[PDB]
Design a protein around this motif. Structure first.
Motif, PDB file in Angstrom:
ATOM      1  N   UNK A  14     -30.518  -7.207  59.896  1.00  0.00           N
ATOM      2  CA  UNK A  14     -30.246  -7.659  58.541  1.00  0.00           C
ATOM      3  C   UNK A  14     -31.443  -7.293  57.675  1.00  0.00           C
ATOM      4  N   UNK A  15     -31.192  -6.615  56.556  1.00  0.00           N
ATOM      5  CA  UNK A  15     -32.234  -6.300  55.587  1.00  0.00           C
ATOM      6  C   UNK A  15     -31.679  -6.537  54.191  1.00  0.00           C
ATOM      7  N   UNK A  16     -32.566  -6.896  53.272  1.00  0.00           N
ATOM      8  CA  UNK A  16     -32.145  -7.157  51.906  1.00  0.00           C
ATOM      9  C   UNK A  16     -31.763  -5.852  51.221  1.00  0.00           C
ATOM     10  N   UNK A  17     -30.685  -5.898  50.435  1.00  0.00           N
ATOM     11  CA  UNK A  17     -30.228  -4.731  49.694  1.00  0.00           C
ATOM     12  C   UNK A  17     -30.943  -4.669  48.353  1.00  0.00           C
ATOM     13  N   UNK A  18     -31.857  -3.723  48.149  1.00  0.00           N
ATOM     14  CA  UNK A  18     -32.588  -3.663  46.873  1.00  0.00           C
ATOM     15  C   UNK A  18     -31.685  -3.483  45.675  1.00  0.00           C
ATOM     16  N   UNK A  19     -30.517  -2.871  45.859  1.00  0.00           N
ATOM     17  CA  UNK A  19     -29.617  -2.638  44.741  1.00  0.00           C
ATOM     18  C   UNK A  19     -28.895  -3.901  44.291  1.00  0.00           C
ATOM     19  N   UNK A  20     -29.004  -4.994  45.045  1.00  0.00           N
ATOM     20  CA  UNK A  20     -28.414  -6.259  44.633  1.00  0.00           C
ATOM     21  C   UNK A  20     -29.428  -7.242  44.065  1.00  0.00           C
ATOM     22  N   UNK A  21     -30.710  -7.060  44.356  1.00  0.00           N
ATOM     23  CA  UNK A  21     -31.688  -8.114  44.122  1.00  0.00           C
ATOM     24  C   UNK A  21     -31.887  -8.384  42.635  1.00  0.00           C
ATOM     25  N   UNK A  22     -31.804  -9.660  42.264  1.00  0.00           N
ATOM     26  CA  UNK A  22     -32.142 -10.093  40.914  1.00  0.00           C
ATOM     27  C   UNK A  22     -33.565  -9.658  40.564  1.00  0.00           C
ATOM     28  N   UNK A  23     -33.794  -9.373  39.278  1.00  0.00           N
ATOM     29  CA  UNK A  23     -35.064  -8.791  38.848  1.00  0.00           C
ATOM     30  C   UNK A  23     -36.272  -9.707  39.065  1.00  0.00           C
ATOM     31  N   UNK A  24     -36.071 -11.006  39.287  1.00  0.00           N
ATOM     32  CA  UNK A  24     -37.184 -11.894  39.610  1.00  0.00           C
ATOM     33  C   UNK A  24     -37.471 -11.969  41.101  1.00  0.00           C
ATOM     34  N   UNK A  25     -36.776 -11.191  41.920  1.00  0.00           N
ATOM     35  CA  UNK A  25     -36.994 -11.189  43.359  1.00  0.00           C
ATOM     36  C   UNK A  25     -37.745  -9.922  43.748  1.00  0.00           C
ATOM     37  N   UNK A  26     -38.858 -10.088  44.455  1.00  0.00           N
ATOM     38  CA  UNK A  26     -39.642  -8.966  44.954  1.00  0.00           C
ATOM     39  C   UNK A  26     -39.373  -8.783  46.442  1.00  0.00           C
ATOM     40  N   UNK A  27     -39.142  -7.537  46.856  1.00  0.00           N
ATOM     41  CA  UNK A  27     -38.872  -7.195  48.246  1.00  0.00           C
ATOM     42  C   UNK A  27     -40.094  -6.537  48.872  1.00  0.00           C
ATOM     43  N   UNK A  28     -40.421  -6.947  50.102  1.00  0.00           N
ATOM     44  CA  UNK A  28     -41.543  -6.409  50.864  1.00  0.00           C
ATOM     45  C   UNK A  28     -41.127  -6.248  52.327  1.00  0.00           C
ATOM     46  N   UNK A  29     -42.032  -5.678  53.138  1.00  0.00           N
ATOM     47  CA  UNK A  29     -41.842  -5.543  54.592  1.00  0.00           C
ATOM     48  C   UNK A  29     -40.565  -4.782  54.942  1.00  0.00           C
ATOM     49  N   UNK A  30     -40.397  -3.612  54.334  1.00  0.00           N
ATOM     50  CA  UNK A  30     -39.228  -2.784  54.591  1.00  0.00           C
ATOM     51  C   UNK A  30     -37.950  -3.584  54.370  1.00  0.00           C
ATOM     52  N   UNK A  31     -37.911  -4.326  53.258  1.00  0.00           N
ATOM     53  CA  UNK A  31     -36.742  -5.098  52.856  1.00  0.00           C
ATOM     54  C   UNK A  31     -36.414  -6.225  53.829  1.00  0.00           C
ATOM     55  N   UNK A  32     -37.441  -6.787  54.464  1.00  0.00           N
ATOM     56  CA  UNK A  32     -37.282  -7.956  55.313  1.00  0.00           C
ATOM     57  C   UNK A  32     -37.912  -9.204  54.722  1.00  0.00           C
ATOM     58  N   UNK A  33     -38.479  -9.119  53.519  1.00  0.00           N
ATOM     59  CA  UNK A  33     -39.102 -10.272  52.889  1.00  0.00           C
ATOM     60  C   UNK A  33     -38.733 -10.262  51.416  1.00  0.00           C
ATOM     61  N   UNK A  34     -38.335 -11.422  50.886  1.00  0.00           N
ATOM     62  CA  UNK A  34     -37.978 -11.566  49.478  1.00  0.00           C
ATOM     63  C   UNK A  34     -38.673 -12.803  48.918  1.00  0.00           C
TER      64      UNK A  34
END
Length: 187
Positions: A14-34
């Motif tokens: 499971x990894x976070x989808x950068x194309x869905x993330x609200x603009x106040x959410x920062x993604x790190x660790x190869x999309x494993x941290x929000x």
């Protein structure tokens, strides 16, 4: 199989989808941290997939017709973890577009001292006490979504949902307050 190994048989990436993330959410660790960094926005491109109002993000991966397991760690009062379908409205302002407000999403909220189970605008406060790490178990043909508190040598059932699944489900995350953070564990 240790107790936890029964679930690890079904581990899924499971990894976070950068194309869905609200603009106040920062993604790190190869999309494993929000992390919710309000009031500091991030310069993401405008995409129909991106959540506009609710501070939400989906997984890239969808799940359909099998059993699956993954672990997350949650930080901060206001975090919700659960499941939804692709068709969740990304640009909506109203509770039907958050993961506690419709009949095709299920989520567990942490409020700073208790968990609360949410489905379709109905909430059930729980008395399970705190768990930093949650194991999320999905039995799609069985209609089960279960959340377990995970410690070194223990798993503890926090809540089991009975779910009427239909479409493929995505892992869904709502970081409702400043400094909320969720990480997906290695597994």
């Amino acid at each position: 199989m240790s107790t936890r190994e029964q679930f690890l048989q079904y581990v899924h990436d499971i990894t976070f989808d950068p194309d869905t993330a609200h603009k106040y959410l920062q993604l790190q660790e190869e999309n494993r941290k929000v992390t919710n960094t309000t009031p500091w926005e991030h310069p993401y491109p405008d995409l129909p997939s991106r959540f506009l109002h609710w501070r939400q993000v989906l997984s890239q991966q969808s799940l359909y017709l099998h059993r699956y397991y993954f672990e997350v760690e949650i930080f901060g009062a206001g975090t919700y973890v659960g499941l939804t379908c692709k068709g969740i409205d990304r640009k909506g302002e109203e509770r039907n577009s958050c993961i506690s407000g419709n009949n095709f999403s299920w989520s567990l909220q942490w409020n700073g001292k208790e968990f609360t189970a949410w489905y379709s605008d109905m909430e059930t406060p729980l008395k399970a006490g705190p768990f930093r790490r949650l194991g999320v178990y999905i039995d799609f043909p069985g209609g089960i979504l279960s959340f377990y508190g995970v410690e070194y040598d223990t798993m503890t059932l926090v809540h089991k949902f009975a779910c009427k699944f239909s479409e493929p489900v995505y892992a869904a995350f709502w970081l409702s307050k400043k400094e909320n953070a969720i990480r997906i564990v290695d597994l």
